[PDB]
Design an enzyme around this catalytic site. Sequence first.
Site, PDB file in Angstrom:
ATOM      1  N   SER D 267      -1.451   0.458   0.178  1.00 63.94           N
ATOM      2  CA  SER D 267      -0.725  -0.235  -0.880  1.00 63.94           C
ATOM      3  C   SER D 267       0.070  -1.415  -0.342  1.00 63.94           C
ATOM      4  O   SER D 267       0.055  -2.501  -0.930  1.00 63.94           O
ATOM      5  CB  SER D 267       0.196   0.744  -1.600  1.00 63.94           C
ATOM      6  OG  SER D 267       1.005   1.440  -0.673  1.00 63.94           O
ATOM      7  N   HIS D 295      -5.075   5.126  -4.443  1.00 62.56           N
ATOM      8  CA  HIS D 295      -5.022   3.808  -5.063  1.00 62.56           C
ATOM      9  C   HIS D 295      -6.376   3.288  -5.516  1.00 62.56           C
ATOM     10  O   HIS D 295      -6.422   2.352  -6.318  1.00 62.56           O
ATOM     11  CB  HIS D 295      -4.411   2.798  -4.092  1.00 62.56           C
ATOM     12  CG  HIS D 295      -2.917   2.787  -4.092  1.00 62.56           C
ATOM     13  ND1 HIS D 295      -2.176   2.243  -5.118  1.00 62.56           N
ATOM     14  CD2 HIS D 295      -2.023   3.258  -3.191  1.00 62.56           C
ATOM     15  CE1 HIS D 295      -0.891   2.378  -4.849  1.00 62.56           C
ATOM     16  NE2 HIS D 295      -0.771   2.994  -3.687  1.00 62.56           N
ATOM     17  N   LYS D 327      -1.701   7.011 -10.455  1.00 60.44           N
ATOM     18  CA  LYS D 327      -1.853   5.563 -10.498  1.00 60.44           C
ATOM     19  C   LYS D 327      -2.666   5.128 -11.709  1.00 60.44           C
ATOM     20  O   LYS D 327      -2.156   4.449 -12.605  1.00 60.44           O
ATOM     21  CB  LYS D 327      -2.509   5.078  -9.207  1.00 60.44           C
ATOM     22  CG  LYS D 327      -1.957   5.719  -7.949  1.00 60.44           C
ATOM     23  CD  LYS D 327      -0.487   5.434  -7.789  1.00 60.44           C
ATOM     24  CE  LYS D 327      -0.006   5.740  -6.384  1.00 60.44           C
ATOM     25  NZ  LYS D 327      -0.356   7.102  -5.921  1.00 60.44           N
TER      26      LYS D 327
END
Lengths: 423, 423, 492, 492, 62, 62
Positions: D267, D295, D327
């Site tokens: 990230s 992610h 997410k």
Amino acid sequence: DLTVKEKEELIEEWQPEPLVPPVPKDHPALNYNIVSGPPSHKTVVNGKECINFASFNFLGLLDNPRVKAAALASLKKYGVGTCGPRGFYGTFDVHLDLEDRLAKFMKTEEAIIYSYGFATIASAIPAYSKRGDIVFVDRAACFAIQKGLQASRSDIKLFKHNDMADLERLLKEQEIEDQKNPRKARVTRRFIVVEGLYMNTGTICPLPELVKLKYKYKARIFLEESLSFGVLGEHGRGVTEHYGINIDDIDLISANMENALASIGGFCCGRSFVIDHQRLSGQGYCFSASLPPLLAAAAIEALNIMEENPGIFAVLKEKCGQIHKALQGISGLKVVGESLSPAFHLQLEESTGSREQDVRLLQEIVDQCMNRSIALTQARYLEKEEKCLPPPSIRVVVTVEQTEEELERAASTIKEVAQAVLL
Amino acid sequence: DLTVKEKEELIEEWQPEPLVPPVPKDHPALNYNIVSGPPSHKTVVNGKECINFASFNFLGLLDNPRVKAAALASLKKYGVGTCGPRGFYGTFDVHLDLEDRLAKFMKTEEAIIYSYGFATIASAIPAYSKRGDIVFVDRAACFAIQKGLQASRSDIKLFKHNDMADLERLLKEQEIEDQKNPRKARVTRRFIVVEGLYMNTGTICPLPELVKLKYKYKARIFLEESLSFGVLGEHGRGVTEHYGINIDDIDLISANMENALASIGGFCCGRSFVIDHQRLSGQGYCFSASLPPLLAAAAIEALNIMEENPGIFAVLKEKCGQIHKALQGISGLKVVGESLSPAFHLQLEESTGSREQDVRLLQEIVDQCMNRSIALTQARYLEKEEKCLPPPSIRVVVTVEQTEEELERAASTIKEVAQAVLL
Amino acid sequence: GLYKRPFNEAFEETPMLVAVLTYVGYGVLTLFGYLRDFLRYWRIEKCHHATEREEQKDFVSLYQDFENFYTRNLYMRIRDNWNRPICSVPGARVDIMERQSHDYNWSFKYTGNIIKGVINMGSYNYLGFARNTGSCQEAAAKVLEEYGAGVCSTRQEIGNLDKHEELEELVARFLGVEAAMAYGMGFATNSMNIPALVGKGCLILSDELNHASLVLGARLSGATIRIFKHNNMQSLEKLLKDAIVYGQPRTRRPWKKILILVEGIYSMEGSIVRLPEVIALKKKYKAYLYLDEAHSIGALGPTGRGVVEYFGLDPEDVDVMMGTFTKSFGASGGYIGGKKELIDYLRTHSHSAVYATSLSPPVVEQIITSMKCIMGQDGTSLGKECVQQLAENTRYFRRRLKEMGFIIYGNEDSPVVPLMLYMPAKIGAFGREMLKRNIGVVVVGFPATPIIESRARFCLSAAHTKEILDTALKEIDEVGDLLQLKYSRHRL
Amino acid sequence: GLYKRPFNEAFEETPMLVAVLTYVGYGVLTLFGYLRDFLRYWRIEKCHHATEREEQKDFVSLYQDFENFYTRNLYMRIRDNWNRPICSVPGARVDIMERQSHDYNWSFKYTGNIIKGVINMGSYNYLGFARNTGSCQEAAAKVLEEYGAGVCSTRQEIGNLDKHEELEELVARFLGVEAAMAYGMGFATNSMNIPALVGKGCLILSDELNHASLVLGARLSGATIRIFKHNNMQSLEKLLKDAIVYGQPRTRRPWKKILILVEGIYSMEGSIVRLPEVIALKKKYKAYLYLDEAHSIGALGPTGRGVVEYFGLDPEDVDVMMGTFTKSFGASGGYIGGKKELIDYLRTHSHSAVYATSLSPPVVEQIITSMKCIMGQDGTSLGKECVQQLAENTRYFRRRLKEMGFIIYGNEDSPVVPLMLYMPAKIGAFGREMLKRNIGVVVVGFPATPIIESRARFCLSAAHTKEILDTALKEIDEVGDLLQLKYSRHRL
Amino acid sequence: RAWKQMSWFYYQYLLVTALYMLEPWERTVFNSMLVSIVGMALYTGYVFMPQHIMAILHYFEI
Amino acid sequence: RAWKQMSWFYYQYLLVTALYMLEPWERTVFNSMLVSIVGMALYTGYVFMPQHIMAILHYFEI
């Protein structure tokens, strides 16, 4: 370094691999042939009467009444056991008589008697060749020669089978390496280890060029005549008589008395200068009991019979010619051998991907022949250990005792069985 | 050192152990209970209707219409997901309202909200205790406390369960070791980690002597009130209200909102001096998403309901008294727990040689009870990982919702089933 | 490691003055050997040695001079004590053909006379089965008449017979192990079945004094070889611990296997192996055991089942039990006993099973008859009498010699009695002085024993009645007085 | 390691003068922090910090001073850029409650006003499923009405329901692997299933920049931990070779297992892992692979099945596939996917399976509805549109910023866009200047990134239409002009 | 009987000094070497060494 | 427009030297320290250093 606690717990973790790996149950070598009665001509294998085409008995001297009578007389005299090495009250008079008879028969100075056919040439080579020497051994050399070479720590160079171009190439490369460093080249001995008639192929070695190469390039020939000792030549002295080569050019001729003489043992013959070293540095000789007297007397009587009539060599030669000529024409098999060789091979023309399928096809042929009263056998090798592993092959062994009709019938039986099975 | 060739052939030999060992198929943990519908009172387990004696729902707030309505309203407002940590646009207003409500309810300065019940006390301890410190943890401490202690690298000292003689002995030995080296003893912090009402036993800790020992020997108490938060005391503030101990003496009180409040999460309350460190050094707080808003609103409504009528604590206490008094008399089992504890145990009086036989006997009892419309459960532990592994035991959980008749029938059913099976 | 009966063995130390005089004698022999070699090189003295043929003089010399030094200058002087050509059955008394040398032992000429009634203390018939008459000889004659002498092919192909199977099952019943396999040479047994069991990546822990067959078999296989001190269990334990811990020498991976090669009775020393401690360490450290029972299979034990019966242990604890029929049973051969998995793996992957001719039929008949006589299957009490008589002979002989003042080695229960001489002239002198008195003894020196320790090994037998032992003891006492062979401090 | 499509990623180097000025700024902050701490100690200045209660002053100090240095003197000055209390659904536009501090960020007071319509670039809804209306919300409302909020017991005992089984089978169909298991926290997933797979005597090869959950999970298990350089396959290969060859550190035995912990998208960096080379080295050296796809599970891929679809590889090659629903799918939770043997072993020996409360029912309903929307099981084209729109947004935003003169990290296809600031005053300045212009950005510095590299991470979404991106780009251009944030040499 | 004692002493000399194995001319070589060295040492003691050693030996003999 | 340019230059100074975060009295402390050190160095150059550096600076300016 290491504290104690992790040492004991390391010792606790460690689990050794099993002593013997689990052998597969479907191993053809695991099931043995149970040959009831003597393994003579017209034997009984696995309960079926079969004419014997599998036993290395070239002259038919195993069952000769004279040989049995001589062995019985010596057994009545001395007994069965010698009870000691050749150094400690283990040298009977029959041993000396047999050594002298061998030396006279082969027209040489000295001969030495070993108690086991493998040990003679597994122990002759390590005595003379030490660490640092060079050995140009043929590629298709029997397992005994391979273990003899491994026992010594010399540098082994394998040339192509019966290919003198390759041997001369190796010798010239050694000449160059010698000229690179002369001080070492002054204390290096060069040996050429060859066999008179190879068991793995059935072909005969070209001594006329090996002798010339030895004399030109300062080498020493060690000859193994095991299979050619009692079959080749007018008087059956081996390959040297077949070629006419002098007996002195070859240094050490080692053979075994098990095949033609039909009595356990082995022997190495040569000039006393070469032989007398083995009496003290030959491990199979110094550190093991001597040959039992009955076997030695049987070998002496066999040598007498070989010396009386030399026509059995001629009749064996003509039977080998007949069977080799008749075997031409197998649909699925090829003959690997020569018209002079007593024991030759039948191999597969076109080999499948896996060796096991070839082995089982040949086993099927062997079994079908056995049911038809001809007993064959397949050549057995140690697949993991052989340096040059030959292709699988049935083995055909000829002898003076098998009649012409039995040879023709063997040829026809193998033809029909091989055409049927390979189809 | 090592030549390249042996390096590649070493890399070739090496064969790794399989990732997961082959689990036995006859593992009771492998087969899960399939609880169709909500796990409420009068549930449906494995297709059989059963009165729920296995779910940690002490106040019966899971199915309360007010809680569901509040959660639905918050779900209509904000949605299901927060989509970020508490540092990055993940702090809603309901989170702050819930933190303030908890702080007011427990009569303290600050409270901190974690998204998962295990992580609250698996992450509170590693924040304060570092390498070199000393922790006197009780022996029968839940797995969350054990993993919290393991995450930090402090020196863990386990004293006997609810045995202040052993704690004082350990503290005095630490005093001697301090007097041995004062310079190190000036920078070592001493923590006593205890639980308000142990899940592995069902017994309550003696805070009147723990407080005195803390004040005498310069220690710091970390209390886990998970199971005693909403059940013990007149107003349900935990074990501190049950004993009357001041709330200031205990440094950090950590609990989870899953059992009594019936909404996922956890929380640690204390003085701002202690709590404010967790907002930056608490891994379960900094590096994970925040609690979904609907669960937070459900917890707020549950706190409201707990604050309105404090008689449910009294009725739960009297039901625990009734069931504990009735359970005395099982032929093959013994009750391990207290008349105040909501969730206690039934263990085997005389244990066989192997733990597995005890496990399967208790499983037989559980299944036979389930067929008779009473749903029990057996305590599940990780046998390989527990430092102090409790004996196997059925678990009996009481609640304000179960009628008196259902309690009497549960007692009689367990009596008959246990006498039959243990016979 | 528990010894039910006492385990007492005595190896008295070399004296000081005797070691000094041994070294002086070896020095004199070495200097005069150098002088004789120098005279031989310059052709000042005629040499009774063969020389390479004239067409091969330019070749590299086959033998390097120094290699044969000890053979030509020391061994050749006393060569007359070895290779004595007996001409009769090697029973309690053997007939030795008389030979003399006019060239100082370079060449021997056989005179007409044959020495008759020589007491034989160099033959291996521990149980006295070496006879030219009896049930065994008649059975061997029947098998010779039927089957014939020698078989002409390998075991796998057509050389397997019924007699071999009978012998293998009989051996398996004899030892007590599940299965056993028979070979035509004990030397071949070791050198051809040790390489099959182990390979590269395994450790072989061999005793200090192993037969040359075991050392050769270990060398042929690629396994690493480490040597521990003779019957020193502390050294074995230390080697086992270090091997298990530190792993392989270069890449410190764990060993695939660890194998311990030991013998029943060490012929030169006479010492019986401490079997219970070997098995204890084996079980503790998870090693494997190879036990050569060439000398102990017919001698040791109340009923002569080996050394495992002697110590009373269980045969199933020993992994591989080698053995040889040459010594006790009076017929050449060898065998390996173990569990059926091992025997099947050997029947498949043994070098001699694949490439070597099998046993002879009369020999296997003699072995079978001897084993049936020992086990009592014949029904007559010859099997019981021989073992008891051999034990009585061993105890009597060892007691009488140790009480005369000699030095003797080994456990008090082993039939081989190595008397000690310690000097290079006395090796020849003892042999010649014995043979002048009608006793045959085996004298061994540097090639087979350490240089300082030169011995005369006696091998007792059940054929030796008490009168023969009395005569041999009287003559050994006389000679020991003559040569000053009584070096014992403790007893006289 | 074959890349079907080009794999281009740019991490432009820190300038010289910028590094020097960063160091000068950090030095000034450190000196004035020392001065402020000195004034606080001597009580010359009033401190807005809590102090230990008077009855516990003689106790050992709970916090050592230096430990909190960076928190009190640097972080507290710019604390107003973190923990912003939003009060609406975190869609494309979020409502932030306005707060001000009169004590220089020591204590915050909430003013009445609420900032409305803030463009949200700090929320994680890559696919834009964070809405308070729609099919997912109505389904969650039904499940809330029926089942209720929260389950009250562990999975093993009575806390397993039917919804959990439906979710697990749906996840297994989604990823393509045989089986999968669902947990209530991705942090818990890592920290509670890494210790189950490995133990003492195994090696864990972890990337340089792993999430704190993976590092904590590796630490809790006893396995040795070695760190290789971030996405440097040469270092991974060297570590693998040395680990396999030299074995364990003290007792050089072979490793039981070797495990490689990697992530889908990092990230902070924005870099996608070189998966094909990781799998190539794994298969070559016989290691095991743990792939955290927190992610990348909803963002990357033509249909959003993760990074394995993005690279086109086979899911069966990856041994353990972690993942998180927070997410993309808009509901808290976690999952692990793999072969059924692994899933059964985890269902038996997972710490959270035994000791932790399971997922909530409305959350699993939301996850199920989101997954069915993505896979097209709903029948409507929302699943196809969102992924294409997210890809277009990512390419457009990265192109526009890289052509303005900024410095941006990571592969060109990753939605997270870390812009770089490099100085400690600019971290606070950028956040405040963005929020004055109605953009919400996430600024991160020393605790989560190396000291010199201080960044402002943008998280793109399928909710951001082109007008929102245009406005955000205009304001970022204005601020970058204001603060001089354009450090790029190559482009301008 | 003295002659037999001397002869056995000589035989012991042959056994100890390894001369038993050596051919007769080798024995003559070694004996001549030993007697030569012994006589040289005796002369050296006569001329260099004091006669007190001779006096001590004479006292010991009587 | 010059005043706005000077003000933005000062703002850049605050951003670069981390003074943006610091309280106003901290800014006054740092500014006083910098001006004091600069004046001391200027005096040291005036008295010790040659005026050729000043001549070079004047030539560069014009």
